[PDB]
Amino acid sequence: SMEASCLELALEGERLCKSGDCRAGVSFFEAAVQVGTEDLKTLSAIYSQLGNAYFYLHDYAKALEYHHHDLTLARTIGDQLGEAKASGNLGNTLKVLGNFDEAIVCCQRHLDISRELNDKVGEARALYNLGNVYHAKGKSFGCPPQDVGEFPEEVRDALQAAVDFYEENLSLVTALGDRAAQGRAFGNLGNTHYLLGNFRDAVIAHEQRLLIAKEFGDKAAERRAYSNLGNAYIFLGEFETASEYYKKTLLLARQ
């Protein structure tokens, strides 16, 4: 039937994206769309795959559109988890585009549904996703030195809010034992502090990020941590310190 062949093409697409070549994976997903199916669970899944595929490819407009169809459809068939997820992805995409307000609503939904269903895994991710949004939002005021000295309570509020999500996230992910996740949260938590002017707090966060990076054998994350650490010391005045972390950074990407 047309079901079977649509099922095949998607399955392929998954292994293709799973194995690095998402460009071709997209094509197989689109193809499976072109074939189509009376099973909307499956279709829903496929649009999602496309949404992310295209997200990774930096074509955010198309990701938005594919997740919006996913979201709609999950609502259509009463798939709460599916709606939680599609929300998340749409939210993140909206963040990337700079439509923070609607992004917040979308990520907020993801959270609420994940709480309802008592999905702690999903709950924590949404907490991280929200973190990034409020971060991005507060970050996108004017430019990122004169900032830390003077800026509006409604921007503070936006950043402090991220901090609160990150911390909550962290807490959650300590329970689930997810080192990777602590990795991500720590980094962004630190930059958020950096902007807020909490530089000693910044360091702590990135030291944890670095440690976790080293533990995973992750050079890019090592690459960053040193970088972000350089910046904070600079703001405390420790230039000889900064000088070295910066050296390590340049020294790293070499290796």
Binding site: L7, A10, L11, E14, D39, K41, T42, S44, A45, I46, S48, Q49, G51, N52, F55, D70, G82, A84, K85, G88, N89, N92, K95, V96, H110, G122, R125, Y128, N129, N132, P144, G183, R184, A185, G187, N188, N191, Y194, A221, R223, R224, S227, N228, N231
Partner: peptide, 18 residues
């Protein structure tokens, strides 16, 4: 200026049927 961590996207599979 600052270096940030990647996003997480939740992910659905066809294999969820199985």
């Amino acid at each position: 200026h600052m270096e940030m961590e990647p996003e997480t996207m939740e992910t659905k599979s066809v294999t969820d049927y199985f």
